[PDB]
C-alpha cells in the first residue's frame, strides 16, 4: 500500500497499518497534503547531457497522471521539442489542463532530432515529470517540467525571474548524442558536461562583446579549450 | 523512523503552494491571472524533517507507480479521500470494545 507520513513532535514517521496508533489525530481533510519534491535535492547531475540520458522511449504503456497540491522551487527545468528525420513529431501534444512548471530559474529548451522509437517518453528511474500540480509519467511537447517524486503527509494540528537557455541536439535518445549551446541563429558553442548555466551566459556575453559572431551565411561552431577555459578555439 | 539513504540532502525547502485563505479579487473577472495565484515559503528550521521527508518521497514511488498501473483513470484526483476513508475504517469499522486495544475509546 501507499505509505503515509505522519509528523509528530517535529519528527516524521511511517504510518503502521496493522498497529492502530491512538495518539494520531485527524480532525479535517485540510491536514491531508501531497507534496512534490525535485530530484535535484538529492544531489544528482542536472546538465542536459546527463539529464537527457535518464529518459527513454517505449510503446505499449498508456500514460497516467496524478495531482499534487504543493511543490518546491526548481532551479533547472526542461522543455523538449523533437522531430523525426522525415519531419514528423515525436512527443505527443499537451492535453488540456496541463501547464508548465510554475517556478523555474533556468529553463533548458532543447530542440533537435532523433530516431524516436516507441510512442512515449518514460523516465528510466521511475520518477515523475511534475508539470503544474499534475505529475505525469510521460513528456509532453513544448511544456516546461521538472523531474520529481510525490509524497503524502498528515499535517500537524495547528523576485521570480526566469531565464531560457537554448540548445540543439542531434541523435536524441541514442547513446551518441551531440549537443550545441546556441548563442545566435548562426553561431553555436560545443557543449560539455561541466558547464554551469551561469558559465554559459558568460560565454554568450564574452562572444558578443568580442565580436566572435558569424558574419557569413554559413555556421560557426566554437570550442572552449579545457585548460585555459577562457580562450575559445575552433 | 525514516533514515535518509540519498547521496546528499538539501535541508531547506523553499516551497510554493496555492491556498491563500479581499474586495473584488475573488471574482474571476477581476481576479489574478493564471500565474499569480501562488504563494511562497521557506522552512529553514527542521529537526531532520526535510531529509527524512525526501526519503519518504523516494520510498512511496514504487507503490504509487503500481497503483497508477492498476487503475484505468486518465487522471487520478481521489487518493487523499481513500486515505481518509481507510483511516476512519481502521479507527472505527465494526464492533468496538471499550477496553479493547483496537479501539480509541477510553473510560474515565
Amino acid at each position, epitope marked *: 500500500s501507499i505509505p503515509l507520513g505522519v509528523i509528530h513532535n517535529s519528527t516524521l514517521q511511517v504510518s503502521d497499518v496493522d498497529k492502530l496508533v491512538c495518539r494520531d489525530k485527524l480532525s479535517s481533510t485540510n491536514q491531508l497534503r501531497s507534496v512534490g519534491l525535485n530530484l535535484e535535492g538529492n*544531489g544528482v547531475a542536472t546538465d542536459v547531457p546527463s539529464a537527457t540520458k535518464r529518459w527513454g522511449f517505449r510503446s505499449g504503456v498508456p500514460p497516467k497522471v496524478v495531482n499534487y497540491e504543493a511543490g518546491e522551487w526548481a532551479e533547472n527545468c526542461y522543455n523538449l521539442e523533437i522531430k523525426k528525420p522525415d519531419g514528423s513529431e515525436c512527443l505527443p501534444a499537451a492535453p488540456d489542463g496541463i501547464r508548465g512548471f510554475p517556478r523555474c530559474r533556468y529553463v533548458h529548451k532543447v530542440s533537435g532530432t532523433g530516431p524516436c522509437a516507441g510512442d512515449f517518453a518514460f523516465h528510466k528511474e521511475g520518477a515523475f515529470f511534475l508539470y503544474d500540480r499534475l505529475a505525469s509519467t510521460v513528456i509532453y511537447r513544448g511544456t516546461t517540467f521538472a523531474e520529481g517524486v510525490v509524497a503524502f503527509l498528515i499535517l500537524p494540528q495547528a523576485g521570480y525571474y526566469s531565464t531560457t537557455i537554448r540548445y540543439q541536439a542531434t541523435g536524441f535518445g541514442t547513446n551518441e548524442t551531440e549537443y550545441l549551446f546556441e548563442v545566435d541563429n548562426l553561431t553555436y558553442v560545443q557543449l560539455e558536461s561541466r558547464f554551469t548555466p551561469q558559465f554559459l551566459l558568460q560565454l554568450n556575453e564574452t562572444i558578443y562583446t568580442s565580436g566572435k559572431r558569424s558574419n557569413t551565411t554559413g555556421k560557426l561552431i566554437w570550442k572552449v579549450n579545457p585548460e585555459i577555459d577562457t580562450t575559445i578555439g575552433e | 523512523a525514516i533514515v535518509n539513504a540519498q547521496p546528499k540532502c538539501n535541508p531547506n525547502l523553499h516551497y510554493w503552494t496555492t491556498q491563500d485563505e479581499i474586495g473584488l479579487a475573488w471574482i474571476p473577472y477581476f481576479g489574478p491571472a493564471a500565474e499569480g495565484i501562488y504563494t511562497e515559503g521557506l522552512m529553514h528550521n527542521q529537526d531532520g524533517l526535510i531529509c527524512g521527508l525526501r526519503q519518504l518521497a523516494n520510498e512511496t514511488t514504487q507503490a504509487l507507480q503500481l497503483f497508477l498501473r492498476a487503475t484505468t483513470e486518465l487522471r487520478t484526483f481521489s487518493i487523499l479521500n481513500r486515505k481518509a476513508i481507510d483511516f476512519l475504517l481502521q479507527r472505527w469499522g465494526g464492533t468496538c470494545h471499550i477496553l479493547g486495544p483496537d479501539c480509541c475509546i477510553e473510560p474515565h
Partner: antibody, heavy 120, light 109 residues
Framework: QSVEESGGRLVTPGTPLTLTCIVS????????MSWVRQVPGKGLEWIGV??????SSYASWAKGRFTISKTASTTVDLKITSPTTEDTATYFC??????????????????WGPGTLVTV | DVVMTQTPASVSEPVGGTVTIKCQAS??????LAWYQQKPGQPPKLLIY???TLASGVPSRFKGSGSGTEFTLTISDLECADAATYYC?????????????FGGGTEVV
C-alpha cells in the same frame, strides 16, 4: 588550480578591513568559494560562501559581522566590519570541489590558499 | 546540523606502527566524509574524500573507511613526516548551508 589571499594588517577595533582572494586555473562561474578562519592553536571555523550564481551565504554566528562579495572577474573579497580583539586569526580561502554529480554540492575543499594573518 | 566528534584527542606511537583515528557523526550521513592533514604553518591538505577514495598524489599508506555514523582513518607504517593534526569534515548538505562541519583535531606524534 591555486588561489591566494592578501590584505592582512594590524588595525584598531572598529576599523573596517578588507581582504582579497584571487584564483588561477578555474572559473568563478563553475565553483563556489568559501572563507574559513583559524584562531591560533584552535580548530577551523567556516565563515561563509559565495556561489557561482552571485548570491552569498553566511554563518549564524557571523550573520552581520562579515560580508563576502565578488570584485572584478577573478577576485573575491571578505570585508570585516567593526572588528574586535577576538578576530585575530589566520584567514584562508578555498574552492569547494565536486567530482561528478550535480552542482550546488561539494566533496572537499581542495585548493586551500596560503592564508593571510589578521591582528587586532 | 550534523555534529562531528573526534574521539582520540592525541596519539603517540613508535615509528613504523599503525595509528587509528575515530570520527563519529551524530546523524547518518552515508559515506560523505573528508580528511585533512595540517602541518604547522601550512594550510590543510586533502587526503581522503567520500570516506574511502584516495586523493591524487597522497601516498597509499593513509587509508580511511567506515559508514553511517562511525568512520575510521588508519595511517600504516608511520614516518617522522606524518606528524600533524588531522581533521574530519562532513559533506552531507549543500554548499549554501554553512555551519561548523569540521572536527576537533587529533595530534599525531
Amino acid at each position: 588550480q591555486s588561489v591566494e589571499e592578501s590584505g592582512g594588517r594590524l588595525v584598531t577595533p572598529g576599523t573596517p578591513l578588507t581582504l582579497t582572494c584571487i584564483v588561477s586555473g578555474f572559473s568563478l562561474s563553475n565553483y563556489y568559494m568559501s572563507w574559513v578562519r583559524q584562531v591560533p592553536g584552535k580548530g577551523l571555523e567556516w565563515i561563509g560562501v559565495i556561489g557561482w550564481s552571485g548570491t552569498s551565504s553566511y554563518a549564524s554566528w557571523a550573520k552581520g559581522r562579515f560580508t563576502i562579495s565578488k570584485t572584478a572577474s577573478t577576485t573575491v573579497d571578505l570585508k570585516i566590519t567593526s572588528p574586535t580583539t577576538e578576530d585575530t586569526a589566520t584567514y584562508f580561502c578555498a574552492r569547494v570541489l565536486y567530482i561528478g554529480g550535480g552542482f550546488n554540492y561539494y566533496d572537499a575543499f581542495d585548493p586551500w590558499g596560503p592564508g593571510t594573518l589578521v591582528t587586532v | 546540523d550534523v555534529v562531528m566528534t573526534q574521539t582520540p584527542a592525541s596519539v603517540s606511537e613508535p615509528v613504523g606502527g599503525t595509528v587509528t583515528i575515530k570520527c563519529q557523526a551524530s546523524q547518518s550521513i552515508g559515506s560523505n566524509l573528508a580528511w585533512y592533514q595540517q602541518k604547522p604553518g601550512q594550510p590543510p591538505k586533502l587526503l581522503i574524500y567520500a570516506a574511502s577514495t584516495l586523493a591524487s598524489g597522497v601516498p597509499s599508506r593513509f587509508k580511511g573507511s567506515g559508514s553511517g555514523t562511525e568512520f575510521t582513518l588508519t595511517i600504516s607504517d608511520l614516518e617522522c613526516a606524518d606528524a600533524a593534526t588531522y581533521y574530519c569534515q562532513c559533506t552531507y548538505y549543500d554548499s549554501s548551508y554553512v555551519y561548523n562541519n569540521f572536527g576537533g583535531g587529533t595530534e599525531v606524534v
